[PDB]
Enzyme design. Sequence first.
Site, PDB file in Angstrom:
ATOM      1  N   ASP A   1      -4.721   2.245  -1.757  1.00  0.00           N
ATOM      2  CA  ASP A   1      -5.544   1.196  -1.126  1.00  0.00           C
ATOM      3  C   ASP A   1      -6.064   1.660   0.246  1.00  0.00           C
ATOM      4  O   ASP A   1      -5.464   1.374   1.290  1.00  0.00           O
ATOM      5  CB  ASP A   1      -4.787  -0.156  -1.044  1.00  0.00           C
ATOM      6  CG  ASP A   1      -5.696  -1.352  -0.688  1.00  0.00           C
ATOM      7  OD1 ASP A   1      -6.931  -1.211  -0.541  1.00  0.00           O
ATOM      8  OD2 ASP A   1      -5.147  -2.466  -0.564  1.00  0.00           O
TER       9      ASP A   1
ATOM     10  N   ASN B   1       0.785  -1.249   0.000  1.00  0.00           N
ATOM     11  CA  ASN B   1       0.000   0.000   0.000  1.00  0.00           C
ATOM     12  C   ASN B   1       0.825   1.313   0.000  1.00  0.00           C
ATOM     13  O   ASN B   1       0.248   2.395   0.125  1.00  0.00           O
ATOM     14  CB  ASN B   1      -0.964  -0.030   1.206  1.00  0.00           C
ATOM     15  CG  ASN B   1      -1.908  -1.228   1.183  1.00  0.00           C
ATOM     16  OD1 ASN B   1      -2.014  -1.945   0.182  1.00  0.00           O
ATOM     17  ND2 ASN B   1      -2.602  -1.449   2.291  1.00  0.00           N
TER      18      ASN B   1
ATOM     19  N   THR C   1      -3.359  -8.400   5.571  1.00  0.00           N
ATOM     20  CA  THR C   1      -2.381  -9.484   5.745  1.00  0.00           C
ATOM     21  C   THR C   1      -1.810  -9.501   7.179  1.00  0.00           C
ATOM     22  O   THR C   1      -1.562  -8.425   7.752  1.00  0.00           O
ATOM     23  CB  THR C   1      -1.215  -9.377   4.747  1.00  0.00           C
ATOM     24  OG1 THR C   1      -0.624  -8.079   4.821  1.00  0.00           O
ATOM     25  CG2 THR C   1      -1.696  -9.634   3.325  1.00  0.00           C
TER      26      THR C   1
HETATM   27  C1  LIG Z   1     -11.105  -5.082  -2.550  1.00  0.00           C
HETATM   28  O1  LIG Z   1     -11.055  -4.816  -3.961  1.00  0.00           O
HETATM   29  C2  LIG Z   1      -9.885  -4.489  -4.600  1.00  0.00           C
HETATM   30  C3  LIG Z   1      -9.898  -4.470  -6.000  1.00  0.00           C
HETATM   31  C4  LIG Z   1      -8.748  -4.150  -6.715  1.00  0.00           C
HETATM   32  C5  LIG Z   1      -7.567  -3.842  -6.044  1.00  0.00           C
HETATM   33  C6  LIG Z   1      -7.530  -3.844  -4.639  1.00  0.00           C
HETATM   34  C7  LIG Z   1      -6.281  -3.515  -3.842  1.00  0.00           C
HETATM   35  C8  LIG Z   1      -5.499  -4.796  -3.551  1.00  0.00           C
HETATM   36  N1  LIG Z   1      -5.441  -2.583  -4.607  1.00  0.00           N
HETATM   37  C9  LIG Z   1      -5.540  -1.232  -4.499  1.00  0.00           C
HETATM   38  O2  LIG Z   1      -6.346  -0.711  -3.737  1.00  0.00           O
HETATM   39  C10 LIG Z   1      -4.677  -0.357  -5.336  1.00  0.00           C
HETATM   40  C11 LIG Z   1      -5.186   0.894  -5.739  1.00  0.00           C
HETATM   41  C12 LIG Z   1      -4.404   1.710  -6.528  1.00  0.00           C
HETATM   42  C13 LIG Z   1      -3.116   1.321  -6.936  1.00  0.00           C
HETATM   43  C14 LIG Z   1      -2.296   2.234  -7.790  1.00  0.00           C
HETATM   44  C15 LIG Z   1      -2.392   3.646  -7.672  1.00  0.00           C
HETATM   45  C16 LIG Z   1      -1.624   4.461  -8.480  1.00  0.00           C
HETATM   46  N2  LIG Z   1      -0.786   3.952  -9.373  1.00  0.00           N
HETATM   47  C17 LIG Z   1      -0.651   2.638  -9.527  1.00  0.00           C
HETATM   48  F1  LIG Z   1       0.219   2.201 -10.451  1.00  0.00           F
HETATM   49  C18 LIG Z   1      -1.390   1.732  -8.755  1.00  0.00           C
HETATM   50  N3  LIG Z   1      -2.655   0.122  -6.541  1.00  0.00           N
HETATM   51  C19 LIG Z   1      -3.372  -0.706  -5.776  1.00  0.00           C
HETATM   52  C20 LIG Z   1      -8.683  -4.164  -3.928  1.00  0.00           C
END
Ligand SMILES: COc1cccc([C@@H](C)NC(=O)c2ccc(-c3ccnc(F)c3)nc2)c1
Lengths: 388, 369
Positions: free
Chosen positions: A209, A196, A228
């Site tokens: 996140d 995150n 986690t």
């Molecule tokens: C519960 O539902 C979900 C669905 C999809 C994903 C997730 C979680 C695991 N990922 C994130 O929140 C998340 C959000 C933004 C970025 C991000 C931002 C800016 N530049 C990047 F290159 C990547 N990276 C990760 C949860």
Amino acid sequence: ASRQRKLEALIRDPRSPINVESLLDGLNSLVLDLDFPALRKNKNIDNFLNRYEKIVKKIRGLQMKAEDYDVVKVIGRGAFGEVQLVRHKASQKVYAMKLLSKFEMIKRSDSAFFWEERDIMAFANSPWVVQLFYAFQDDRYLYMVMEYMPGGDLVNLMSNYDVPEKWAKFYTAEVVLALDAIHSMGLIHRDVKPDNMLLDKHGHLKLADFGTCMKMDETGMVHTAVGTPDYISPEVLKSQGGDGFYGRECDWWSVGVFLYEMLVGDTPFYADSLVGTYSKIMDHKNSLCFPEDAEISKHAKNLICAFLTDREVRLGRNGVEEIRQHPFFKNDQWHWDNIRETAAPVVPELSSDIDSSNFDDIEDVETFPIPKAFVGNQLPFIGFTYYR
Amino acid sequence: ASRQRKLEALIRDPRSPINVESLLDGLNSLVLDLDFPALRKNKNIDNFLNRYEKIVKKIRGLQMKAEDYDVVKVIGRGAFGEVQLVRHKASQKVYAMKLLSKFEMIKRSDSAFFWEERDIMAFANSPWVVQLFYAFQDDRYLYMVMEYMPGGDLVNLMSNYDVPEKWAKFYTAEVVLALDAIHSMGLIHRDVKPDNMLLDKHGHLKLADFGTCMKMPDYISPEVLKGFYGRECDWWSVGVFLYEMLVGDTPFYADSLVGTYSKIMDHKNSLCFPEDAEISKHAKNLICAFLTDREVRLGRNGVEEIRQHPFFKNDQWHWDNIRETAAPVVPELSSDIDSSNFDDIVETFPIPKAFVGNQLPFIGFTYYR
Ligand SMILES: COc1cccc([C@@H](C)NC(=O)c2ccc(-c3ccnc(F)c3)nc2)c1
Ligand SMILES: COc1cccc([C@@H](C)NC(=O)c2ccc(-c3ccnc(F)c3)nc2)c1
């Protein structure tokens, strides 16, 4: 009229639930929930849909949608969807677009988490938070168009680089200021970790996140799904079994775990099984030992131990100021007021606007049933659309 | 950015179905249809209503409502409601407010008529049409706040006064220009009569009651008494109107309704002017010109042939300035709430098991000038 100025003030306000975009979502959601062959046997439903047939098809064309963006590559995966590296077809500007399946959120009984996530990214106005430019939706998914962070997560950094202490001072200090901004907004993160923590085009930190984020009560606490287990604090590992409360201190635990992982190389409460990891976190007084081979200072040892204690005597109860004055953070490189304007340790060398070399390749869709009566599957997502 | 300017243009437009007031009606209607104890057993419905609990109670307070107006007197009655003489509590301005019951419109299968009625009065911008300042609603009724017409209807006038021909020339000519304005807007009235002809503070004509209006039994025309029909059916009723003022009674009058229908179908034989009645040759000619079969009627080929008819010649007014000349009967009104020209004149929806959507036909009705 005096009441009409108050009414127009509410609709102009972007934080308000009755803004123009939220009101348009209400109409779209109503038509999506109603427009089925069975429900049109009702006379009131049929005549309503025929009035708003042409205008809803027009607004769906004009409003933002998935077809406006070309999907370059999938850069992350989560529980209810994925994060896509995308380019807008008109402007040719690169973004990171998070998808969230409406079916999966309804099925697994978790469809309130995205509100704080949308609001944090949209409205923080902070250089420590990933900015949300556009939020929008269709019948299947919610979408969150964000600024792309080509430097990658801090898992990527720790794998590729053997991280020295001067680098660890920097990245920890940026995490401290990042969490202070989130704590200032009235929120506990609940899931602070390297996954995150993302690095921008200049190698500086922003947090992403915000799913586990919840707004604090009046005391500064909160009362149910977890991240986690490596970074979770012991007070959270008892509250999950029947009620329980916890404050901002649970995030500061994870900074201690974060500072340990960069300097040492492994997690402090690591085990083969999950049950072993949980047991070591509960027995943190005995189980926390620094390896004798590991290159760590006395001040960094002191700070990790200051974070890794029981909640009642932890570092970060009485504000951020006691963390900032800790001797570990002293250096002849940056100060607290100007850390984000100094040169980062690892500046990414990126070949193009769609370079995702700092992200690993992600490995590779049931819909709602056509209902008999009114179910209202789109009603939880009214108000989500946002235009900067 | 080019699509967002087009989207904001639609929402700013007051004729558009997705304006700010219509969008607020959609939210209020959704909450009214959903907020019941049975429907809240659904998780999606319960969590939606809890989010929009406080803001909907706030918007209901801020928006216009029946509690803002004091009811002075009931001045008319109709099928689905009544017309109230009202005063706005803040501004102290007098209006005529038409009520329409949502239960009665849903029950009797007639809940599209009010759209053209609202639009005609709101958007005509004509001195021959009663102006609508505000339209609004609650769970029970629709409301239409209009300019008050203290001179009263033309039924009131014909009862009180023995109407001479110079007066009849005036009021008929104003009806001709009034219907021409409605015909110019792309509409047939379908129910032109003295009840629907109101007199303002100065004794000049405006039309009210646009329920029977659709876009392109004493007063109903024979072609309607069966199909299809045009603007000519309104011009029939002007002939019946001109007959009633000069003669005193309706031309196809009977004791029963069946007699009235039969005389209208047999209009070639049954139309006879009483020998005692004081009527000119030109006024006789104009009534007969209006009271024919549709195919050869006066008013097929525009209003111009009606305007050049010799009956309408006078040394008082012209067609371009008739509404600025002095009226025959100027009302002598004692106050802003004087209703001396008007005579002296509630089951709800059941709490439903599932979603019924009783408020859905009334989304878009609210209007603020
Ligand atoms: C519960 O539902 C979900 C669905 C999809 C994903 C997730 C979680 C695991 N990922 C994130 O929140 C998340 C959000 C933004 C970025 C991000 C931002 C800016 N530049 C990047 F290159 C990547 N990276 C990760 C949860
Ligand atoms: C459809 O159900 C109905 C419910 C109630 C009423 C009616 C019909 C019969 N009356 C009218 O339309 C009507 C009549 C006079 C006025 C009016 C306008 C201006 N100044 C006034 F002093 C009175 N406004 C409206 C129908």
